[PDB]
Amino acid sequence: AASGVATNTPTANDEEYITPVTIGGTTLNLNFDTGSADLWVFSTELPASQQSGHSVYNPSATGKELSGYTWSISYGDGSSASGNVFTDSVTVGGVTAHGQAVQAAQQISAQFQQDTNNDGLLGLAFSSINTVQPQSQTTFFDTVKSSLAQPLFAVALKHQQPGVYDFGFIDSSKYTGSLTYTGVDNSQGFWSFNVDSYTAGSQSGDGFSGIADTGTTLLLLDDSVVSQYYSQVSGAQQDSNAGGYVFDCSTNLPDFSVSISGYTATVPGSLINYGPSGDGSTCLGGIQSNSGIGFSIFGDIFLKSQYVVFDSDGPQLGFAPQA
Numbered sequence: 001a002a003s004g005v006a007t008n009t010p011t012a013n014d015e016e017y018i019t020p021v022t023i024g025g026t027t028l029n030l031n032f033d034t035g036s037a038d039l040w041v042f043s044t045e046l047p048a049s050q051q052s053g054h055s056v057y058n059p060s061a062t063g064k065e066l067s068g069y070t071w072s073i074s075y076g077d078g079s080s081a082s083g084n085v086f087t088d089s090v091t092v093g094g095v096t097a098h099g100q101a102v103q104a105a106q107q108i109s110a111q112f113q114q115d116t117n118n119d120g121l122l123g124l125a126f127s128s129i130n131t132v133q134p135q136s137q138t139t140f141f142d143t144v145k146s147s148l149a150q151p152l153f154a155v156a157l158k159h160q161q162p163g164v165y166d167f168g169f170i171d172s173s174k175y176t177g178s179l180t181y182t183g184v185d186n187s188q189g190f191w192s193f194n195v196d197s198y199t200a201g202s203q204s205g206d207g208f209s210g211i212a213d214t215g216t217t218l219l220l221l222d223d224s225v226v227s228q229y230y231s232q233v234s235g236a237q238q239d240s241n242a243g244g245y246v247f248d249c250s251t252n253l254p255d256f257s258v259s260i261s262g263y264t265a266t267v268p269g270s271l272i273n274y275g276p277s278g279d280g281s282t283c284l285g286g287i288q289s290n291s292g293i294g295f296s297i298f299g300d301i302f303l304k305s306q307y308v309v310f311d312s313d314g315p316q317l318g319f320a321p322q323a
């Protein structure tokens, strides 16, 4: 039975986490994203100027083309990418998927052209939302799941320290206490769950649903919750240059917690200080608006506090405080 550990590393201010992945012999640095189901990589089919500063996959060396197959994806921040498809061998933390669909980029939007920190994305959401046409493909996890000791993966994302992706086993040394599990609704292809209540510093409110998403930097909540939070932060103001609410970096921020099937997941106020807003001298908050979409995005700010288990049996998610 297989199992493996892949080490992730945060970029500046923990904007994203990258992990090495070997595709057909070449190692690429990918962003593992539990909010999408496509594994796409920078490739030799991009214009040479766009290949600059990245490790690129060359489909000709080792891939088997899926004649007539395309992909096209749009994300929540407006970025997009498209191209064609090959099958190849993909290895992550020593677990190899043979015949895994690899989506070679032919076009990428500016957000991706500007980021030289990643060479593409490895999607870990449910395969039902894979964008490959005319027939959707399976995610690396779905491809190998049956070979793993347990059909699950776990994540520990940290603040300015390397963390891990555990595939096929749970590392009990990564959290304190026991895990608490909650049911997952995968009908829209996400790792979606419910919270029964929330506490934003001195205020509490009723529950809502959200998705566990390693591909989103911040904790994105309803505008109502965001207002309530920042009403308790002296001098907090919105700065469109910074991307949302900002405050003096020395501010004491309140904690944020959610109650999930009896377990209180707490994000300490020190983790809600994302970092320098880059707009003078203020800092950007880790909590920002979800733009009225109707559900919350439990992104990296939230995940840095927890060890999270993504279990295909249920499905369900397990949580515990990171050790």
Ligand SMILES: COC(=O)[C@H](Cc1ccccc1)OP(=O)(O)[C@H](CC(C)C)NC(=O)[C@H](C)NC(=O)[C@H](C)NC(=O)OCc1ccccc1
Binding pocket: 015, 031, 033, 035, 036, 074, 075, 076, 077, 078, 079, 121, 213, 214, 215, 216, 217, 218, 242, 243, 284, 293, 297
């Ligand atoms: C179709 O579903 C998705 O797109 C899913 C789920 C989602 C749905 C709806 C809204 C938001 C997210 O996103 P995802 O796949 O995680 C997708 C992957 C990235 C690589 C494009 N992230 C996103 O779209 C989010 C909003 N983008 C981000 O968090 C970008 C990477 N980071 C980012 O915005 O950092 C915040 C920041 C602001 C200002 C200054 C510095 C930092």
Ligand SMILES: *[C@H]1O[C@H](CO)[C@@H](O)[C@H](O)[C@@H]1O
Binding pocket: 001, 002, 003, 004, 149, 168, 169
């Ligand atoms: C993960 O689990 C597998 C199956 O138990 C081990 O063989 C592997 O070495 C790693 O501990």
Ligand SMILES: *[C@@H]1OC[C@H](O)[C@H](O)[C@H]1O
Binding pocket: 005, 006, 007, 008, 162, 164
């Ligand atoms: C990344 O890969 C494997 C190990 O867990 C180690 O902790 C790391 O540097």
